[PDB]
Symmetry: D2
Subunit: 121 residues, 4 copies
């Protein structure tokens, strides 16, 4: 559970994200996706509950990745919102929103939604 968010995680797509969880709620690290107009690592920043409940619940967290790095700019940003659950097999279950910058004309179709499950395997 605590600390354990820190590590390298992988999702079903093969994306990899390396995060560091700070004692007070911050999440910092890099994200490398396996799909989209992405190329290399991208910086990610987020927050998590540094004092989750002492009952059998997960730890709420979220993070953002703007898809711009020294190699590509896909003019989009993704936010993942979910919870971490530890145990012999820890995982982070998330739902995400990917918004692309559009002209007002196409704002209605600017956001994709999906889900990703991350494990340390």
């Amino acid at each position: 559970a605590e600390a354990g968010i820190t590590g390298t995680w992988y999702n079903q797509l093969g994306s990899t994200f390396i995060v560091t969880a700070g004692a007070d709620g911050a999440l910092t690290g890099t994200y490398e996706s396996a799909v989209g107009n992405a190329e290399s690592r991208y910086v990610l920043t987020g927050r998590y509950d540094s004092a989750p409940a002492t009952d059998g619940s997960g730890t709420a967290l979220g993070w953002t990745v703007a898809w711009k790095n020294n190699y590509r700019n896909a003019h989009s940003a993704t936010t993942w919102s979910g919870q971490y659950v530890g145990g012999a097999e820890a995982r982070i279950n998330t739902q995400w929103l990917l918004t692309s910058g559009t002209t007002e004309a196409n704002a209605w179709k600017s956001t994709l939604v999906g889900h990703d499950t991350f494990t340390k395997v």
Copy 2:
């Protein structure tokens, strides 16, 4: 543009968002919500496209607030995903996901989704 996003913003619920856009695509600031099991200010961190398009396209950005501060802890976190659209009346149109920590069993009802529009007041 960092400058354009930087400022004080408010949404239809009456919540306050104070943000500074850094040159590196970083967003930091505080959020004051008008609703929920939230009391006072909460730290927020996000990222935005610091090199958007010359198209009248919006600038994509997103940020997260974990609802825990020194006074309260709602054991939940919200992420806002949207676009900043400048002009005389600058707006940040978003869609958000609010996830609460739950037991495996009620995880199916852990996430709420909605949308918020922010209007700029100050830098």
Copy 3:
């Protein structure tokens, strides 16, 4: 109330929604979209709570439109999930999911999410 939902509604994009609420909680009608790879009217079917609450709570409902008719086929379907709120100015506030058929590989980008507000004009 079936009666209250029954009518012609329009949303901010300029799309038309003609619906009849049946006594059994059924919704049937047609949708005319102002946007997308959609041309003409499409059949819609949904359900609503025919026994809502005496609370000023909204009436929950939802409906689906597969974007295929005798003139076009966009190979996608949208479901709107929301609440009907009556009064002098009746509204149906919704959030929708638009899924396109894709190959396993691009399934990660198969669904769009948004929100639409409908205003009633006629019964």
Copy 4:
């Protein structure tokens, strides 16, 4: 692929839904959930693409369930939007929205979002 949507499907939660796909795009059947303020079968109605593309893509579909039957009324409705994919192991991958009727005061928290995968196993 075609016809094959018709059948009894189960999701990870144990919910069961029996659907009939009509030649022209309609989906009709019953839903029995394993979670929430649900009890028995609930009627469901939806639509699907009766002429999906002839390429390796899934068939888009969606359906709604108002959670009211002769036993319970949870004053909510769920819509599932996703696509069907056939093969030796067919499945329906969906994302859903569950909206509860609220007073304006609580409209901001009226909708839950999740995902369900259905198989005939």
